Amino acid sequence: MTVKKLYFIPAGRCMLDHSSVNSALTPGKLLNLPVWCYLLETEEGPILVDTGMPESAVNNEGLFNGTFVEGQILPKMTEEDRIVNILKRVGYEPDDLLYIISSHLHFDHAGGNGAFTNTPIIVQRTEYEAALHREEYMKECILPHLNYKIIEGDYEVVPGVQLLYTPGHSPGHQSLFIETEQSGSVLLTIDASYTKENFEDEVPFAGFDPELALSSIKRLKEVVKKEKPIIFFGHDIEQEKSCRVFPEYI
């Protein structure tokens, strides 16, 4: 069984210093990068991958002033980019969703999690546990009483939707391997590679544990050699130019 539709849904944007996409570069040039969520229409119901940025980021580029990352991360988010507004425009309310999948709990992926208080939120145990104490996590991304479905390692969500454990960028980061009716095998790296060159050329990028991130890339390359998927990266300005986005699907 395959997924019926895989939608790429723009969920606002974020400025990052360009040393975050290539650790070699000298800081000083910001890049206006895409923030994504993905909607999977399946036999069993709709599944949302990631939930955009938090409320506090709306009309607030200076959100991280006063923090260790001041000036080097600036969210670009309007009221329209709140995940409940995105969902409503597409045609859903939060309680319609079968599952939320959190690739990881960075603020541009889990900022909207609080809107889903009934839907199971599938997240790696190592990511959940890290978010409870590491300083790069926002309180909006680790709310205590949501319906977490904590998993450990690779996991089949529904037929055609596989989670691949890809730690390194964050301690419990996970990627998606999807089989769609229209396109066959699709690999969503999410932040296991911001860009094509992080993946193909193993250019280092921002992460918790870059050595681990490299071994997760190598693991994904083994999957790619076996399955030959089309591959989409997490924060790639170049690839964004040719991506099919909502209302188009793959």
Q: Which chain residues interact with ligand XNG by CB under 6 A? A: 16, 64, 67, 69, 73, 106-109, 136, 138, 191, 235
Residues within window 101-160 making contact with Co ion, judged by CB under 5 A: 106, 108
Contact indicator for 212, 203 with CB cutoff of 8 Å? no
- Please, which residue, 8 or 249, has the CB nearer to ligand XNG? 8
Q: Does an H or E element contain 37, and which? A: strand 30-42
**What is the distance between the alpha carbons of residues 68 and 135, in angstroms, rounded to a whole number?**
9
Q: Annotated binding residue at 133?
A: no
Residue with tokens 């995105």: 86
User: 218: alpha, beta or left, given left = phi > 0 and alpha = psi -120 to 50?
Assistant: alpha
Does 179 participate in binding Co ion (rule CB under 5 A)? no
- Please, which residue, 179 or 236, has the CB nearer to ligand XNG? 236
CA 220 to chain centre: 16
Q: How far is the CB of 182 from ligand XNG (least distance, A)?
A: 28
Q: How far is the CB of 36 from Co ion (least distance, A)?
A: 8
Does 17 participate in binding Co ion (rule CB under 5 A)? no
Residue 95 φ then ψ, to 5°: -75, -5
Q: How many helices (H) and strands (E) does the chain have?
A: 6, 12
How far apart, in Å, are the Cα atoms of 29 and each of 20, 77, 108? 10, 20, 20
- Please, which residue, 82 or 109, has the CB nearer to ligand XNG? 109
Out of Co ion, ligand XNG, none, what residue 190 binds, judged by CB under 5 to 8 A for its kind, is none
Residues within window 188-217 making contact with Co ion, judged by CB under 5 A: 191
- Please, which residue, 82 or 235, has the CB nearer to ligand XNG? 235
- Nearest C-alpha neighbor of 47 from the set 88, 87, 106: 87
Contact indicator for 44, 72 with CB cutoff of 8 Å? no
Q: How far is the CB of 64 from ligand XNG (least distance, A)?
A: 6
- Please, which residue, 127 or 191, has the CB nearer to Co ion? 191
Contacts with Co ion, residue ranges (CB under 5 A): 106, 108, 191
Residues annotated as binding site? 104, 106, 108-109, 169, 191, 235
